[PDB]
Design a protein around this ligand. Structure first.
Ligand SMILES: *[C@@](C)(CO)[C@](*)(O)[C@H](CC(C)C)NC(=O)[C@H](Cc1ccccc1)NC(=O)[C@H](CC(C)C)NC(=O)[C@H](CCc1ccccc1)NC(=O)CN1CCOCC1
Ligand SMILES: *[C@@](C)(CO)[C@](*)(O)[C@H](CC(C)C)NC(=O)[C@H](Cc1ccccc1)NC(=O)[C@H](CC(C)C)NC(=O)[C@H](CCc1ccccc1)NC(=O)CN1CCOCC1
Ligand SMILES: *[C@@](C)(CO)[C@](*)(O)[C@H](CC(C)C)NC(=O)[C@H](Cc1ccccc1)NC(=O)[C@H](CC(C)C)NC(=O)[C@H](CCc1ccccc1)NC(=O)CN1CCOCC1
Ligand SMILES: *[C@@](C)(CO)[C@](*)(O)[C@H](CC(C)C)NC(=O)[C@H](Cc1ccccc1)NC(=O)[C@H](CC(C)C)NC(=O)[C@H](CCc1ccccc1)NC(=O)CN1CCOCC1
Ligand SMILES: [Cl-]
Ligand SMILES: [Cl-]
Ligand SMILES: [Mg+2]
Ligand SMILES: [Mg+2]
Ligand SMILES: [Mg+2]
Ligand SMILES: [Mg+2]
Ligand SMILES: [Mg+2]
Lengths: 211, 233, 222, 226, 204, 196, 196, 233
């Protein structure tokens, strides 16, 4: 996998590839690694597909009962912490999860990294997965706070592409999301095969590759 | 988790036009030691089912008791225990298969391979296999252990598919089983000459044959074999 | 040391049409280099226009199917004979699988049927409950042999329109049941040639609004 | 693999299947497992494919040189002795399991040989993963004083047992008959019971379907004159 | 750790009517990392073509080795080596390292200059020959290639038809393998002309 | 395996079963474990089939070369050559051998050579996995200076029991009689010895 | 250990050696392995001394309680209680037990219970490390309906050989005779049985 | 590196006023099996030395041959081979000790424990031990294996230190050795009743006693021992 997310002026961008692997064998290439917890909350998946899917779906149900008892949408911090405490019970037992809880709440846009090891970190920029290391190069070099929605969406898309190209266990297609205070907005599924050639021509990058 | 101590080898079986046949030798081995020579590994359940068991003998004796108790329990408050609500081969098998899978799921298995052979109420032939892992399958011929490697090929020459079953008589089927038992005696180092054979026919019922022996063996050609290559004397 | 798992071989294949779905699988059961059965059914009609096949370790596959069939039975009892939709079954199966996250069902699992809009649906599961709706999916021993062929012949991957030279793709035209069954038979005949655990027979279950139909074809017995 | 050897009245016959595996995958559907050591000494091989070939080519080469040196037709016991000493020396690491048979001035002979260097004598033998399925047939149908035609039938029936019942064996049956006072007849694909059925569809593509970037002529010829 | 899957790669060869074709991917990696998209795995010694998959150092080494041996063969024999003869030389050379083998999966392809007969062959890492009539596959996506070739292939294909068949077999197999791709080349070989085509594929 | 060699009035008799195994599979049911290293010096082989064949072949070579130079070797000499191989290569071998031969001077002699490569001259010897079950029977029933017929019955009865209890033993009972009269081969089939 | 139980005309006789070891050290040379679980139901113990004692003590408790409620238990019943313990605790036990008893109705009966916890009713039984060496001797010499004197000699000769070949067996030969007449203890010392 | 197969147990010995005594049983064990009952483990070298060996018997037979060859070699070009230049116990021991240490230094040992017992030219008693590691030591009493644990305590009650040697007669010393051999038969599970004993005296020379038996044993008290605690019958 490659997944990323970052805070900025106009909310938070969330992007991810779609490849699923079983050794060298590419089992699927149509996997949704972004889970919609509520119209204002997203969750990313990396590592154990089954683990990430189960626990984040179970979290979405915790976040919903919260809204019913409290007449109030759960905060990003509280949601991230419920997950963290849930997976902490099974620590050392074999769980493999690398997630980011992205959303907009009362404190503005929120972004937390949560994993099966026990980490829970608030931050403006994250990337988790086998291809995260490639994505960080593009993010760190081009990331501002004063970024337009159009340019921010492109950055997250271009970052996954960088990783999808180099990392053997990343690719397929890019799923984009933009989270505002009026909720998240899906910005499509983009095949890396087609996207790569397009970006190569328009941007001039990947000069080493022939096409 | 354990290891098997006293063991029973192959159990072989096949379907024929009117029923099923099943056979197994009378040996209880203790590693390489052929310890117990009078062990019955075919266990009838009523007059319509025979359970053939291989593997650990202590676990076999346990299963034998579960089956005996099953008959006792089925008769309780059951006026039709010797008629419509009698035990069927399919009931007996599913019970065992349930137990075997539960025991493997607790990491404390019954170290056996079992073949349930019988004839149902409607006259249909029943033949199904189950083992220590809870794995089940059915086929026109079934065999455990070495029999799977040596007997099945011979029995599949008689009944290669489902459509060959009606064409196969009891005389032909028994002949094939008896031949397979001879071959296993030639080639299986944990087998015995003495064996038991059971036939469950939809017309003539259950016939249980004990104290059978492998006969018509070929050994005479051994006298001409000398050395391992170059030796002449 | 006691090993609670085993490998019974077998291969399965699900393809979703526009108003139908197929779930195919070979009928061969094996341990190591021995054949247990040449005809041991692996694909089942579970009710509510849903077909299912779970295998690898036969004993775990039989148990999962048995449990899901039971889940359908109790869904009717508890919710006024309501029909279990394919998406609801998929989610239910995830929870059956993850209930043994720390002693897994050692199986590949695929279900097929029709969605609530009447269109064909195929869902794929990993041993611990990660599931995906797909158009085409093979699982089991020869999954890696078959899937690339289906990427090419069902989704027209790497296929472009002549004359344009890579500028315009082959358009995604839907397939008929008759065209799909041809791909299924060719897939399994090819897999039988190069995989030792695949052969003997091929059983196909087709699902339409009218119900569930079966088709059986022989395969090589070597 | 399944391989067998059967003696008869005036000679000996060997047979083999034609499958070669790489795990659960079939690498070759029509492999040739019957090897010629000398004109009238043939061996069938099971185990590590390269080892059965290499060890056979080597001993066959040395047997040819021996035959030329001694001005005599090679003997089966010579091939047997040379093979077992070679295999014993490598202590089983050369995974060759062979059935060696042939006719020579001494008569007709049939031996088996294992990777660790042990040899066995018999009227009927079987080696490989399907050896049990084949031996079941041999133990059921073999008799003394077989004819050539009866022995070929028994041998191919034994290989078929392996083909059908053993997953490590399949495809076709090869046979080689070595009769006294005659040329050895190598019957490649004696039986062909596993032909693939016609495919339902043709997958021939329209020309221009594949996307291309560059084209170029490859110079395979040498440097030219003038 | 597994030497045969560190660098990744695939090779496939097919026969046709009075022609042969051999193809390969262009990827060289260090496990998950992609290093080069120009690592061609097909070499030729006169009119005999050799594709090699597996450990890249051994691929490079064996090419240099067979170039060495075929150049000497030619100087002594006063003629180019043939595919049948070259196939035996590859087998001989690999088995001489029986207990310290090159971690490779070679594939020979060519047309006998005298008989005009198309020829392909495959080997395991220690030298066993697999002489096939239809096709040969090798690499990290060998299972995938077997599935594509066994269903797409039909005998007596014309050069321009064979090109499409082998290209689609390679491309779709590579797209189901993480360790294969990053470009592809196809050689179409006839008795006295050889065309080489680079394919356009997804770069992930 | 089940092997034994017994001295008697007129010479010595070797005996053996005919089973060789690969785990529980019987790879050969008509094996000849009684092998000749010289005209009237034979051996019984137990352990690895490959090792015991390789050894017996080397010994036959040594004694053939001995004979060409120094004439007929003694049974003690043959046992010494076996020992030298089994002892010096003890780390790499798995061979339990009984050496038996007939001289006119020394008459019948039996030497047993177990795993370590030690030598033991005995009136009779038993070896192989199946020998364990007949230590009691053989000790109780063996007498010195038996007749040929008595010795054949002793071996027949002994190996019958060994075969009966040991799964690694079976098939036919082969025997080789070594006397001044010459060399006689005997064979006894299951139907004969099982009913004893 | 070497243990055995043999049925005969008037009842049953149990027999055993008296050696218990810790490696090659003989921790006790005058051990009593013939233990009583009821008036005329005894057992022979082999395997772990701790395990077999713990088991025999529990069985004696069960049969004492059985007797108080239901009267004298059968030998089959005693064997069943042994089995239940040995089978259900097979993972944690190392016990090879022979159960022998005398009824007036059933007369002499012998049940053997090896490691797994299986039960086998037999005319006679042998067990322990030393039993291996006398399978052949016992099979050849056992007859049904022997006299008391014949049965004592059979056991004496059998255990004599077992002791002779097995290092883990030795000391005295203890025996217990179970008949209608009562319970008789016998003992035989090395000087008596070694010269047999 | 190897493992011992056929083995010999304890060798025991002690000094007395005019010489040394050494003893060892006649058994060649094969694990727990008491395989060979006629094995001589005391090997005389001339008329002034006896080498007692325990451990691997194949290695013992090898050492026995080295010693036999040593005598042959010492006689070569030596007119005083049966007099002044005869083999001494100290020569024989140092040779063996050299071989044992060299073999352990090549990681291919002779799996034995050896006691060399004899009387020197000047009438001095010689008694020294060497084993598979090349470790050597001397004492008034020496014993290998189990004898080190059971025999030495008994023999040290007779000769506790050097000054007790002149006070100890041959009758007392032999009596102590014979008693120790009885104790080892009671308590060593790899021992035999039959044994050999050798005396090397500076006056009466070498006396080699074969076919000795352990006698005067106590077993009668066994009849009174019943059960393992509570049992009365
Ligand atoms: C990138 C693509 C890889 O790092 C991402 O991290 C993605 C994240 C997405 C899918 C949410 N991760 C994977 O693709 C992930 C990698 C992985 C595999 C196994 C454990 C942890 C991480 N792949 C999976 O989770 C696959 C998804 C399947 C192919 C749809 N699942 C498996 O491989 C399953 C799960 C196994 C399992 C996990 C925990 C306990 C028990 C079992 N395993 C199998 O199907 C068995 N496998 C089949 C292939 O042959 C080998 C055996
Ligand atoms: C029946 C079919 C199976 O028992 C027969 O016994 C045949 C015998 C005939 C063909 C002579 N045996 C095989 O087909 C044999 C089975 C086998 C496999 C592995 C070990 C021993 C026996 N198959 C082979 O030998 C193949 C032949 C190829 C397909 C042409 N070779 C391999 O599978 C090699 C094994 C090489 C080897 C080296 C050292 C010791 C033992 C074996 N394996 C590979 O090539 C796998 N891998 C591919 C990627 O590159 C790295 C190696
Ligand atoms: C009786 C059986 C026991 O003492 C006899 O001694 C006979 C003696 C005659 C045949 C000389 N011995 C055997 O039959 C002998 C038993 C044996 C087995 C293994 C090691 C030593 C002794 N059997 C063999 O030697 C067979 C003969 C082959 C089948 C022709 N060989 C094997 O079983 C080989 C030996 C490899 C080996 C292993 C360890 C040490 C030395 C050699 N083993 C295998 O082929 C492995 N086999 C396949 C996979 O399953 C495990 C067993
Ligand atoms: C013959 C000897 C063989 O079958 C008999 O069966 C007799 C039976 C009579 C005594 C009941 N068996 C023994 O004497 C028996 C043999 C034995 C040894 C170890 C395990 C099982 C059986 N000996 C013992 O039980 C002794 C009795 C002590 C000396 C009083 N116990 C031990 O040797 C204990 C055993 C502890 C134990 C280990 C494993 C499983 C169960 C129990 N061992 C020790 O004290 C340490 N010992 C010495 C160093 O080596 C390790 C063992
Ligand atoms: Cl042999
Ligand atoms: Cl006790
Ligand atoms: Mg197949
Ligand atoms: Mg790829
Ligand atoms: Mg990639
Ligand atoms: Mg036997
Ligand atoms: Mg003793």
């Amino acid at each position: 996998t490659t997944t990323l997310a970052f805070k900025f002026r106009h909310g938070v961008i969330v992007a991810a590839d779609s490849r699923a692997t079983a050794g060298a064998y590419i089992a699927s290439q149509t996997v949704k690694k972004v889970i919609e917890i509520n119209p204002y909350l997203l969750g990313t998946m990396a590592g154990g597909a089954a683990d990430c899917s189960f626990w984040e779906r179970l979290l979405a149900r915790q976040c919903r009962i919260y809204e019913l008892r409290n007449k109030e949408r759960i905060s990003v911090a509280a949601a991230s912490k419920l997950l963290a405490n849930m997976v902490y019970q099974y620590k050392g037992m074999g769980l493999s999860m690398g997630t980011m809880i992205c959303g907009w709440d009362k404190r503005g846009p929120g972004l937390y990294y949560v994993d099966s090891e026990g980490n829970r970190i608030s931050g403006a920029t994250f990337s988790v997965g086998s291809g995260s290391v490639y994505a960080y190069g593009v993010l760190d070099s081009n990331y501002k706070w004063d970024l337009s929605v159009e340019d921010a969406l492109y950055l997250g898309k271009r970052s996954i592409l960088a990783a999808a190209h180099r990392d053997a266990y990343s690719g397929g297609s890019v799923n984009l999301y933009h989270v505002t205070e009026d909720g998240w907005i899906y910005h499509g599924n983009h095949d890396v095969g087609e996207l790569f050639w397009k970006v190569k021509e328009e941007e001039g990058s990947f000069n080493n590759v022939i096409g | 988790t354990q290891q098997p101590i006293v063991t029973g080898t192959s159990v072989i079986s096949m379907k024929y036009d009117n029923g099923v046949i099943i056979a197994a030798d009378n040996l209880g081995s203790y590693g390489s030691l052929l310890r117990f020579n009078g062990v019955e590994r075919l266990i009838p359940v009523g007059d319509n089912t025979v359970v053939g068991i291989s593997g650990d003998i202590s676990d076999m004796q346990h299963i034998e008791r579960l089956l005996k108790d099953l008959v006792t329990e089925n008769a309780y408050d059951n006026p039709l225990a010797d008629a419509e609500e009698a035990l069927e081969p399919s009931y007996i098998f599913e019970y065992l298969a349930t137990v075997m899978y539960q025991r493997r799921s607790k990491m404390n298995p019954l170290w056996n391979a079992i073949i349930v052979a019988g004839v149902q109420s409607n006259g249909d032939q029943f033949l199904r296999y189950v083992n220590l892992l809870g794995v089940t399958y059915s086929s026109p011929t079934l065999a455990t252990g070495f029999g799977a490697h040596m007997a099945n090929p011979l029995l599949r020459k008689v009944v290669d598919r489902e459509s060959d079953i009606p064409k196969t008589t009891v005389q032909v089927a028994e002949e094939a089983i008896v031949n397979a038992m001879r071959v296993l005696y030639y080639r299986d180092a944990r087998s015995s000459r003495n064996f038991s054979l059971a036939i469950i026919d939809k017309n003539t019922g259950l016939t249980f044959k004990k104290n059978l022996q492998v006969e018509n063996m070929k050994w005479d050609f051994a006298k001409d074999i000398k050395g391992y290559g170059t030796q002449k004397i | 040391q006691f090993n609670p798992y085993g490998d019974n071989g077998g291969t399965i294949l699900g393809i979703a049409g526009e108003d139908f779905a197929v779930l195919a699988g070979d009928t061969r059961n094996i341990t190591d280099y021995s054949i247990n059965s040449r005809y041991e059914p692996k694909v089942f009609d579970c009710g509510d226009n849903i077909v299912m096949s779970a295998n690898g370790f036969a004993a775990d596959g039989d148990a999962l199917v048995k449990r899901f069939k039971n889940s359908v039975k109790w869904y009717h009892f508890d919710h006024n004979d309501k029909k279990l939709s394919i998406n609801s079954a998929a989610r239910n199966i995830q929870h059956l699988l993850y209930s043994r996250r720390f002693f897994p069902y050692y199986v590949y699992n695929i279900i097929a049927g029709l969605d609530e809009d009447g269109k064909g649906a195929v869902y794929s599961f990993d041993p611990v409950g990660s599931y995906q709706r797909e158009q085409c999916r093979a699982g089991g021993a020869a999954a890696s042999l078959i899937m690339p062929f289906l990427d090419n012949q069902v989704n027209f991957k790497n296929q472009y329109e002549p004359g344009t030279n890579g500028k315009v793709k082959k358009p995604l035209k839907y397939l008929s049941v008759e065209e799909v069954i041809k791909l299924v038979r060719d897939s399994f005949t090819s897999a039988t040639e190069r995989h030792i655990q695949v052969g003997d027979g091929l059983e196909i279950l087709i699902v339409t609004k009218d119900g569930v139909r079966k088709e059986f074809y022989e395969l090589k017995r070597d | 693999t399944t391989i067998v050897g059967v003696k008869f009245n005036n000679g000996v016959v060997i047979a083999a299947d034609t499958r070669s595996t790489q795990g659960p995958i079939v690498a070759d559907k029509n492999c040739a497992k019957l090897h010629r050591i000398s004109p009238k000494i043939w061996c069938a091989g099971a185990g590590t494919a390269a080892d059965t070939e290499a060890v056979t080519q080597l001993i066959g080469s040395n047997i040819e040189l021996h035959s030329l040196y001694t001005s005599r037709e090679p003997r089966v016991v010579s091939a047997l002795q040379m093979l077992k000493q070679h295999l014993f020396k490598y202590q089983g690491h050369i995974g060759a399991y062979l059935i060696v048979a042939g006719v020579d001035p001494t008569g007709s002979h049939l031996f088996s040989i294992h990777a660790h260097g042990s040899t066995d004598v018999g009227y009927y033998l079987s080696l490989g993963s399907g050896s049990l399925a084949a031996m079941a047939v041999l133990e059921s149908h073999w008799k003394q004083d077989l004819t050539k035609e009866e022995a070929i039938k028994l041998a191919s029936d034994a290989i078929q047992a392996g083909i059908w019942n053993d997953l490590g064996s399949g495809s076709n049956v090869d046979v080689c008959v070595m009769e006294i006072g005659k040329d050895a007849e190598y019957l490649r694909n004696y039986l062909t019971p596993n032909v693939r059925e016609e495919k339902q569809k043709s997958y021939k593509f329209p020309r221009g379907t594949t996307a291309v970037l560059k084209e170029s002529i490859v110079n395979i010829c040498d440097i030219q004159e003038e | 750790s597994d030497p045969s899957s560190i660098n990744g790669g695939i090779v496939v060869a097919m026969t046709g009517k009075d022609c042969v074709a051999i193809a390969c991917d262009l990827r060289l990696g260090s496990q998950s990392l992609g290093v080069s998209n120009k690592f061609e795995k097909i070499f030729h010694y006169g009119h005999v073509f050799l594709g090699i998959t597996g450990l890249a150092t051994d691929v490079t080494t064996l090419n240099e080795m067979f170039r060495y041996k075929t150049n000497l063969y030619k100087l002594k024999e006063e003629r180019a080596i043939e595919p049948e003869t070259f196939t035996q030389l590859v087998s001989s050379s690999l088995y001489e390292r029986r207990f310290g083998p090159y971690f490779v999966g070679p594939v020979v392809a060519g047309i006998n200059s005298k008989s005009g007969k198309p020829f392909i062959a495959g080997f395991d890492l220690i030298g066993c020959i697999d002489e096939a009539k239809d096709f040969i596959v090798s690499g990290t996506a060998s299972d995938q290639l077997f599935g594509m070739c066994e269903s797409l292939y039909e005998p007596n294909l014309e050069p321009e038809d064979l090109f499409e068949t082998i290209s689609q077999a390679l491309l779709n197999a590579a797209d189901r393998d993480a360790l294969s791709g990053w470009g592809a080349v196809v050689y179409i070989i006839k008795k006295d002309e050889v065309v080489k085509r680079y394919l356009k594929m997804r770069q992930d | 395996t089940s092997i034994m060699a017994v001295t008697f009035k007129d010479g010595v008799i070797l005996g053996a079963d005919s089973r060789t195994t690969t785990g529980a599979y019987i790879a050969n049911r008509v094996t000849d474990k009684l092998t000749r290293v010289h005209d009237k010096i034979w051996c019984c082989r137990s352990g690895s089939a490959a090792d015991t064949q390789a050894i017996a072949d080397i010994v036959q070579y040594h004694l053939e070369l001995y004979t060409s130079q120094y004439g007929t070797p003694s049974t003690e000499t043959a046992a010494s050559v076996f020992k030298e191989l089994c002892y010096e290569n003890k780390d790499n071998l798995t061979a339990g051998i009984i050496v038996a031969g007939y001289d006119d001077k020394n008459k019948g002699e039996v030497y047993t050579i177990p795993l370590g490569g030690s030598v033991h001259k005995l009136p009779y010897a038993i070896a192989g996995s199946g020998s364990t079950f007949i230590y009691g029977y053989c000790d109780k029933n063996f007498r010195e200076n038996m007749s040929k017929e008595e010795t054949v019955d002793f071996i027949k009865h002994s190996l019958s029991q060994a075969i009966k209890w040991d799964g690694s033993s079976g098939g036919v009972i082969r025997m080789v009689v070594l006397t001044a009269a010459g060399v006689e081969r005997l064979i006894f089939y299951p139907d004969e010895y099982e009913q004893l």
